[PDB]
Symmetry: C4
Subunit: 153 residues, 4 copies
């Protein structure tokens, strides 16, 4: 079984770097923007996100990973708008939500608690969710996010 | 077999948020909530002729680490509660909540003020946490697991 | 089989509080001379005139040295006692665990500063580990106990 | 089966101290052989005629002095020169950002960015903050190596 995971977030958030770092992660099996990521016996198929009749992103999707640039205080309102537009889709009713508060290495960034509060994460009533501080330049924090998704299978 | 836990603290401490976050925690299987960890079932009561204290195995005390004015109030209630006959064998887990807030009391400051290292008749653990993110909550739950009979 | 551990350090370092907190630690089974059980392993821990003998080093498997991180005035005394102790042939096979205690207090010596002052990386004939800790919360104590377990 | 490992870096980086501390590490059983669980590593702290990277080098550990802003460019050049060697094509790369205890040192993220680590295409790599005076961070570096066998 392949478990479908999509990676969303605004440009420059760290989506490419995060998916790349997943392959280097200690809990992820070694392997030589659509990557199969294997943890123990579990296979995830991860997608880093006109003539098509269909938007295919949300279909059969088990986890959405939202990447947030923690340094960007102005665009966070845009991330929030997109988060809630996305959560309004019936396709995602069963999906777990993992939020990466990325670029936590940068001084004066928003704290993970400030991000949780602004995004009103504790008001979410119909989805499992987890917010995780991370730095995609080092992979710090990514293992914890992946292990949370594993616990939600 | 259900293991009874009561969650107590002053208003605005974080009780509702902590119990909600338990449901989202990595160690937990997906006012009164069943929380399952591995094969262990906890029945957790958020407090706020009957007594909620009956058959309690764990007391979780939530402390707002920013509330310097009312930590004296929490201390008095803590020790008043520890003297109840229903609670004499109970494990005590103290969450020093709102640790994300700048200039809050530190967990060591809270331990020292509450005189926790002077407790003689109860297993206890104090744990820094932030209920907005669930950080610290896993460690608190894991400590309770290790105190199961 | 009891594994003998001694807890040493200057007055006010935190020896009493640490031994107390061992009883509350997640890795320790719920239960100044105390039996501490971790999984199946039993440690007999002693927190240290008319006696003919120094009995503290006899058959001692681990020495826990508790250092007050805030105490810059007496760190040289800790160092002297550490090396006098380590010169004892009785302790030739003992593992050394150093708790850099009171890490919660602002402007305390860092664990690296303590290690450098104590010249710990110059130790040639003993297994050793230094661990930051706060005895008021038990933070750091688990890591210290796990290191001893790994040295059995 | 011995898994061969070389430890490299400029003078004063912390190579001697790190290899020393591996033998004191919790995950390690009590030029050196380091055993983790059932796995034997043979580790050479590099620093001659007819000498080169010993055959079947499985891991390269690069030690970076985090305080050394002047010479991090020197280290970057040596790193990529090493990564160009055909006989190191299958090698895992573990970078220890050492001396993280020293105030105002480069952060691990600054080091990763300067070394352009996330642009590496042909190797498994991990960067790990550490302090060789205490051993902090060494365990995680060793564990990453174990996961790459
Ligand atoms: N300082 C810092 N930079 C990062 C981090 N994650 C990614 N970046 C950088 O931010 C830029 C955008 O990253 P990228 O992964 O391409 O973002 P994407 O547009 O969401 O796919 C690149 O220069 C990355 O190196 C981080 O955690 N900290
Ligand atoms: N900044 C911060 N706010 C928190 C934390 N935990 C809870 N809160 C907020 O504090 C307020 C009271 O929390 P709540 O769970 O309702 O407290 P209760 O009265 O004890 O049940 C709410 O607005 C929460 O979102 C925390 O760790 N940090
Ligand atoms: N702030 C702080 N105080 C501590 C810590 N550990 C112990 N203490 C306090 O230090 C004092 C001496 O501790 P004690 O355990 O009696 O030291 P002993 O003389 O070595 O046995 C007591 O007031 C303890 O509560 C700590 O980690 N931080
Ligand atoms: N402050 C600090 N000093 C360190 C650290 N690691 C090593 N050193 C010291 O730096 C010096 C050089 O270390 P060494 O292991 O001999 O480096 P080598 O030349 O690469 O083998 C010695 O004095 C060590 O004690 C560290 O993490 N922090």
């Amino acid at each position: 079984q392949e478990h479908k995971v999509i990676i969303v977030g605004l440009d420059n958030a760290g989506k490419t770097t995060i998916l790349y770092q997943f392959s280097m992660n200690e809990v992820v099996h070694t392997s030589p923007n659509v990557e199969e990521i294997v943890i123990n016996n579990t296979r995830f198929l991860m997608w880093d996100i006109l003539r098509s009749s269909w938007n295919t992103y949300y279909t059969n999707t088990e986890f959405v990973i939202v990447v947030v640039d923690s340094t960007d205080r102005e665009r966070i309102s845009v991330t929030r708008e997109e988060l809630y537009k996305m959560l309004a889709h019936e396709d995602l009713r069963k999906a777990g939500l993992l939020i990466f508060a990325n670029k936590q290495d940068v001084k004066e960034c928003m704290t993970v608690a400030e991000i949780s509060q602004f995004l009103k994460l504790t008001s979410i009533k119909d989805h499992q969710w987890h917010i995780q501080a991370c730095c995609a330049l080092t992979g710090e924090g990514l293992c914890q996010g992946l292990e949370w998704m594993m616990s939600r299978l």
